[PDB]
Structures are given as structure tokens and as C-alpha cells.
Amino acid sequence: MMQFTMSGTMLRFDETTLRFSFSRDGATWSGCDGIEPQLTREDRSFSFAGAATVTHERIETGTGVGVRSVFAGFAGADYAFETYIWIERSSGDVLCEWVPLRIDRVLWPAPLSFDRADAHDVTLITHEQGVMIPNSWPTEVGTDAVSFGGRFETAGGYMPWFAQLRSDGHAYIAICETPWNAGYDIDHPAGGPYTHVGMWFEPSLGRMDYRRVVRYRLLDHADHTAICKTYRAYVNERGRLRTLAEKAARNPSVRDLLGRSWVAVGIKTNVQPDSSFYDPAQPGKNDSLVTFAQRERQMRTLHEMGAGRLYLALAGWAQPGYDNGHPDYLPACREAGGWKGMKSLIDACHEQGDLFGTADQYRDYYFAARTFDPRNAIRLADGTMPEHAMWAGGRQTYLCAELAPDYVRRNFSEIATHGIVLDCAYLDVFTCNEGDECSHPEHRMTRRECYERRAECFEYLLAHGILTSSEEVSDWAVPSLVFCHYAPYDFQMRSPDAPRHGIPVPLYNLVYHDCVIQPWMMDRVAGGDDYMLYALLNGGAPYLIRDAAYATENDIERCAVVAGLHRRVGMQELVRHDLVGGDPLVQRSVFADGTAVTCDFHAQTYEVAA
Ligand SMILES: [Zn+2]
């Protein structure tokens, strides 16, 4: 019905159906017929075309051309909102805006049709490091199987985009320009023949509040590499491509992480009788203690065995024990040797050229915390204070992030008074789990503000010369994050017996390899993959020891191979990644200086060349 042509792009919008298509360089993409743009409330949904009044206006401005649609009245309810869909003159991009005027979820824009029934027609999603889902993929992939329900700014969506790429090189990327109350939905049935992906948006603190915007770029001659580069260029243009070199200009020790092997081990374990981990028929059971002196002797032994340059990330070092008592996670554990033993351990690391970081926690807020007061806690939009008793420390709520920098400043300043000069710090959860929202009147907070406050925690550390790390790499944190516990592939977070959702590809690293340093799992799956092959493809650092929270001479040789590559390319762009001859099981990564890593998953072998 309405047709626009501008700067090489065509947009078509049917006034009656609300469907749209767009075309560029001789490829057309059309919204799925039979999937309507929707609103959701409780157990039921509403097509936008369910509005009592719907008016469309044809627009042209100095910057673009397109259609503004106004929707008013839903079953005598007075809800009203606007959409604006337009071609940007200077780029040929298509922008889609959802504009509140006054709802649990808005599913808009409708997913695009991608049922071509090819084989090499694929969908790219940012659920952890990266997934390439062919239309023929035999495993079902639904939002319910994606971490955090496909929420952006979390492990479900490391980056606020998704893309689909036909086998003839024509592709689109959909970037969510307003990601903080948003996510994607995915529907790929077992065996195909289609995959549908679409944006979702939720209210902020109970109202839709601010305009939601999605930017589509149609590409030709494209590959998953090119699609990732499009996002990288988008991010840099907006000033959030904070490279390691920019980080290192401020904190030169950034460089000292290159070529290090990671050791992540703990001190005190203490499962309270209300934890979901507590076995009441076995009171001792999980409770354990390894002393600072034992960890000191371990580091000395690793050094003497030729483990090379190490980074030690130390968990459960404070009196309450791991996942207990936060944010009152002090002092250093007396039974483990106290501040004196903790300093001895750090001194010893430093003496042998290794680095040291504490693991800590500023979101989980335990009722057992010495200063627990529910006025500091989150209240959800509905007024409630959320609680659960999952972790070792038992009953908890969440500390409102408006207050977290106050506690980080307090705790880290206390640690420094005891002569402990941390190289690094690990703030758990922040860059894996979603940002909370808070309606508490003493500290009201949007999800957006939550990520800013978590970033403010990192900034404190950087300003004090302490390099920042958190659980994963959700890209809100890229400006303030030096490293992570990992940036793993989704299949590495599930049983190796579980069917995978697609072909693993290093989508995150294609954007940000030169911005965030990452250690990689070194596990060998019996009958299956050796995870060292993915560390190499991602030009990552190796774990020498990774003691996962809830439950050598060869390892050193393997770590040396990985750390040697890392020493060279850990600050370089990952320029290209390809499936060699289209074989998903032979993969090749190329870094900025031309170093090429080829991993053959048939043979379980690797080769480093140019
Ligand atoms: Zn609050």
C-alpha cells in the first residue's frame, strides 16, 4: 500500500495488514504473514491491528522517509502508542520506532520470513559467545532454552542484535538501539525448515516509558564476519568500543594479563542450613577450608613445576565463606590465616611474578549479612522485595545497585588498609545476570541505571589501578571491563550430552576480541571436543585450574601453547572467522597481524600459521 524508495533501499508497508517488507541490492525481506505485531498482558495477547482507531501518515524529513502509525483503544481500554518506520537517507538503514503516548511485553517488529528451506541459510544469535543456526538444524531452539529468556545485556544476549544470512550472501542485522528493557525471541523447530527471530520489549518500572528503536541494515556479499563488523562499527561510532589499548593507556598493567594461565580456587566453603545446597541429613558435607598457607604452597609448587606466568583469582577468602554474608564480606577468614596469611599469599605471588585478584559479590544481599537492612534492598515494580535461598549463604534479596558503589568503596578500602594491593578484582554476576529495576523511593532505579551503577563499581577499581573482571561479557560493560571469568559458548554451559543449538562461532570476539581479555575452559570431553581448540580459535588465555563454585604437567604443556598465542594476539582484533570450505567442523580464525588458527574438529587438532 505505502511504498518508499531512498538511497538504494525500498520499504513497503501495508496499511491494512501492518506487514512490511524491505529490499536492497536486489534482495527482498518480508515480515512473516500470520505473525502480527503484539502486546501482551498476563496470559493473553493483542494484535496492534486490534486497536479501535488506526491512522497512518506518510512522512519525509531532512533525514529520511517513511510511515508514522498511531494506535488507540484496546477493548474500550485507553491505551495509545505510535510506530514510525523509515528509511535513513544517509545510509539506507531502516529504523523502526515504538513510541509510547500514555503491558507486560511488546513483540515488535514482527519477525522476518526466513523459511527459504535451504541448508546454508542461517540465523546468528548472541546467546553467549555465539550461535550459527542453519535452517535445517535438527535440534529445536526456542526462547525458553536461551539463558535469561533472550534478554539483551545478559548471557542470553551478549550483544543487542541478531541477524539472518541467506546462502547467497544477502543478509540483514537487526540492532536494538534501546536494549535495557529488551530481548529477542527465537523459534527454530527441530529440523526447520524456518527460523524466526524478533525483538521484545518490556516496561521500565511498570510503564513503557521511553521510545524503543531497532535499526535494520541490509547487506550483500555478507558472511558472519561481515555481519559482526557491522555491529563493531556501530558501537565505535557511538563511543563504546573501548579497546584494551585505551584501557592500558590508563592502567598499563592491562598488558600484564597477556599470556597468563588462570588459577581459580577457594578458601572457605560454608553452606547454611537454609541453602538449597544444604543436606540436613549430612550437616558437615559441603563445609570446607583450605588455608591461605596451603594456597601459598600451591602457587610456589606450580611455579617450581614450570607453570609460567599465572593469575590467581581467589574465592571464599572472607570470614562468612563463599556466597555468605555479602556485602559484609569481611574480614579475611581467621581460620584460613587472616589478613596476615592473605597478605603472605599475595606477597608470595608477587615475589614469583604472578598476579592476584579476589572474588567478591555485590548483588546478592544475604539476610545473615552483619548489616542487613531491607531498606537497602530492591523493590520490584509491584512493591515486593524479592527473596530466595538458593546459594550457600541461604536467605537473600538483592542489594539495589544505586548503593553498590558505596559498599565496594567501603570494602575495598578496608582490604587496602591491611597492605593488600590487588592486581585485579572479580565482581561476580554483574556481567552475566540482568540489571535489576527498583521502585524503592529511597533509591529508585531503572535497568539502564543498574548497568551504569555496576559500571561505576568497575570504575572505582580501575581508578585505583585494579583491573576489573566479572562473570561473563554482556556488552554494556565493555567500557569498564578488562576481563572475565569466561566468555564461553552456550554448549560449554550445558552437559556435553545435550544436543547443541547450532554451530559455534566467535561472534562476540569478532566484535570485541581487542577490548576484553578472556580465559577459556581447557576441559577434554571424553568421546568429544577438546575445549583447548576453542581457546585457540578465540585467541584466549587458558585455565590451568578452574574450581567451579558448586560441585598438571600435561595441563602446563597445553596451557603454554594457548598462552603463547595469547601473548602475541591477546590485544589484537580478531579480523576473520570462517568455516573452511563451509565445513562447520573445520574452523579458521585470523588475527590483525595475519596469525591464522585452524582447528579441525574431525581430527581434534590445531595448527597455527599465517
Ligand atoms: Zn533501589
Cα-to-chain-centroid distance, residue 202 = 19
Contact call for residues 112 and 28 (beta carbons, < 8 A)? no
Which segments of 293-371 are extended strands (E)?
A: 310-315, 355-360, 364-366
Q: Dig out the grid coordinates for 29 from the structure.
A: 525481506
Residue 143: phi, psi to the nearest 5?
-50, -40
CA of 430 from ligand 1 middle (Å) equals 16
Q: Which residues have C-beta within 8 Å of that of residue 301, sequence separation ≥ 6?
A: none
User: How remote is the CA of residue 450 from the centroid of ligand 1, in Å?
Assistant: 9
Answer yes or no: are the C-beta atoms of 99 and 213 closer than 8 Å: no
- Backbone torsions φ then ψ of 537, nearest 5 degrees: -65, -25
**DSSP β-ladder status, 483-484 and 467-470:** parallel
- Local structure of 482: helix, strand or coil: coil
d(CA 523, CA 283): 32
Compute CA distances 458 → 1, 153, 254, 316, 424, whole Å: 51, 16, 14, 20, 11
CA of 398 to the centre of ligand 1 (A): 10
CA of 407 to the centre of ligand 1 (A): 14
Burial of 53 (0-12, 13-18, 19+ CB in 10 A): exposed
**For the chain, how long is the longest CA-to-CA vector?**
77
470 DSSP 8-state letter: E
Taking the centre of ligand 1 as the mean of its atom positions, its distance from the CA of residue 358, in whole angstroms, is 26
* Ligand 1 centre distance from Cα of residue 524 (Å): 44
Could you give the dihedral angle defined by the CA atoms of residues 14, 114, 97 and 478, in that order, rounded to the nearest 10 degrees?
Answer: -170
Distance (Å) of CA 261 to CA 309, 312, 318, 506? 6, 9, 24, 21
* Interval between CA 441 and ligand 1 midpoint (Å): 7
Alpha carbons 366 and 370: distance in angstroms, whole number: 9
Q: Which long-range contacts (CB under 8 A, 24 or more apart) does 292-298 make?
A: 292/267, 292/317, 292/332, 292/336, 292/337, 292/338, 292/341, 292/342, 292/344, 292/345, 293/337, 293/341, 293/344, 293/345, 295/265, 295/267, 295/345, 296/341, 296/344, 296/345, 296/348, 298/265
For residue 411, the CA-to-ligand 1 centroid distance in Å is 20
Burial class (CB within 10 angstroms; exposed 0-12, middle 13-18, buried 19+) of 553: exposed
Residue type at position 473: V
The rounded Å distance from CA 474 to ligand 1 centre is 22
Q: Give 473 Cα–ligand 1 centroid separation in angstroms.
A: 24
Distance 443 CA to ligand 1 centre (A): 4
Please give the distance, rounded to the nearest whole angstrom, from the Cα atom of residue 436 to the centre of ligand 1.
9
Q: Give 380 Cα–ligand 1 centroid separation in angstroms.
A: 9
Which segments of 62-179 are extended strands (E)? 64-74, 77-88, 94-100, 105-107, 122-125, 131-134, 141-142, 161-165, 171-176
Query: How far away, in angstroms, is 414 Cα from ligand 1 center?
Result: 25
- Ligand 1 centroid distance, CA of 123 (Å): 38
Ligand 1 centroid to Cα of residue 324, in Å, is 22
SS3 69: strand
Q: What is the distance in A from the centroid of ligand 1 to the CA of 343?
A: 35
Residues 287/267, Cβ–Cβ less than 8 Å:
no
Centre of ligand 1 to C-alpha 571, Å, is 37
Q: What is the CA(379)–ligand 1 centre distance, in A?
A: 7
Contacts of residue 288, defined as CB under 8 A and 6 or more positions apart, other chains included, come to 268, 269
Question: Could you tell me the CA-to-CA distances from 256 to 64, 261, 326, 584 in Å, in that order?
Answer: 48, 12, 30, 34
Task: Tell me how far the alpha carbon of residue 439 lies from the centroid of ligand 1, in angstroms.
Answer: 6
In 3-state terms the chain splits into helix, strand, coil percentages (rounded to 5) of 25, 35, 45
Q: How far is the CA of 435 from the centre of ligand 1 (A)?
A: 12
Instruction: Report whether 115 contacts 193 (CB < 8 A).
Output: yes
Distance 272 CA to ligand 1 centre (A): 27
Comparing C-alpha atoms, which of 359, 367, 521, 356 is closest to residue 424?
Answer: 356
CA of 279 to the centre of ligand 1 (A): 34
- CA–CA separation, 375 and 385 (whole Å): 10
Identify whether 193 is preceded by a cis peptide bond (ω within 30 of 0).
yes
Distance 446 CA to ligand 1 centre (A): 9
Name residues whose C-beta falls within 8 Å of residue 257's C-beta, 6 or more positions apart in sequence.
Answer: 311, 355, 424, 467, 482, 483, 517, 541, 570
Reading the block at residue 295, the C-alpha cell is 594456597
Neighbours of 51 (CB within 10 A): 19
Cα gap 316→322, rounded to integer Å: 4
Domains of the chain: 2-237 (2.70.98.10), 247-485 (3.20.20.80)
Output the CA 448–ligand 1 centroid distance in Å. Answer: 13
Task: Give the chain's length.
Answer: 610
Residue of 480, 343, 473 whose CA lies nearest to 405:
480
CA distance 404 to 376: 10
Report helix, strand or coil for 565: helix
* Residue whose cell numbers read 512490511: 20
Q: How far is the CA of 276 from the centre of ligand 1 (A)?
A: 26
State the cell numbers at 103.
Answer: 503491558
CA-based nearest residue to 106, from 73, 75, 142, 82: 82
User: What are the two backbone dihedrals, phi and then psi, of residue 288, each rounded to the nearest 5 degrees?
Assistant: -150, 170
Query: From the CA of 408, how far away is ligand 1's center (Å)?
Result: 16
Distance from the alpha carbon of residue 403 to the mean position of ligand 1, in angstroms: 8
**Bond into 504 cis (ω within 30):** no
* Assigned C-alpha cell, 5: 524508495
How many A from CA of 440 to the centre of ligand 1?
5
Helices 404-417 & 447-463, crossing angle to 10 degrees? 20
